[PDB]
């Protein structure tokens, strides 16, 4: 059920920002333009 995980989970799907980073604790992929490696919803 983990689809569209090529695009930053913090970025809206209409924006389509490629996720170069991924938050390890939740495995949600993120753009460094939003969060550096770790998503704000963890720790
Ligand atoms: Zn983003
Ligand atoms: Zn996270």
């Amino acid at each position: 059920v983990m689809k569209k995980r090529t695009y930053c989970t913090y970025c809206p799907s209409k924006i389509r920002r490629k996720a170069n980073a991924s938050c390890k604790k939740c495995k949600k992929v993120i753009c460094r333009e939003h969060n550096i490696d770790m998503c704000q919803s963890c720790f």
Side-chain angles (χ1 to χ4, degrees):
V1 300
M2 300 306 177
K3 68 281 191 57
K4 66 176 182 297
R5 60 175 177 159
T6 315
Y7 295 94
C8 168
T9 309
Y10 278 56
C11 277
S13 302
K14 295 302 186 65
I15 303 302
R16 284 186 61 179
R17 181 81 78 233
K18 299 285 189 177
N20 299 330
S22 305
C23 183
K24 308 303 179 299
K25 189 174 183 294
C26 63
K27 296 301 298 294
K28 272 64 183 182
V29 296
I30 51 176
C31 75
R32 297 177 59 203
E33 185 181 84
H34 262 145
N35 272 144
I36 303 300
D37 192 269
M38 177 182 59
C39 91
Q40 188 186 150
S41 301
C42 292
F43 297 93

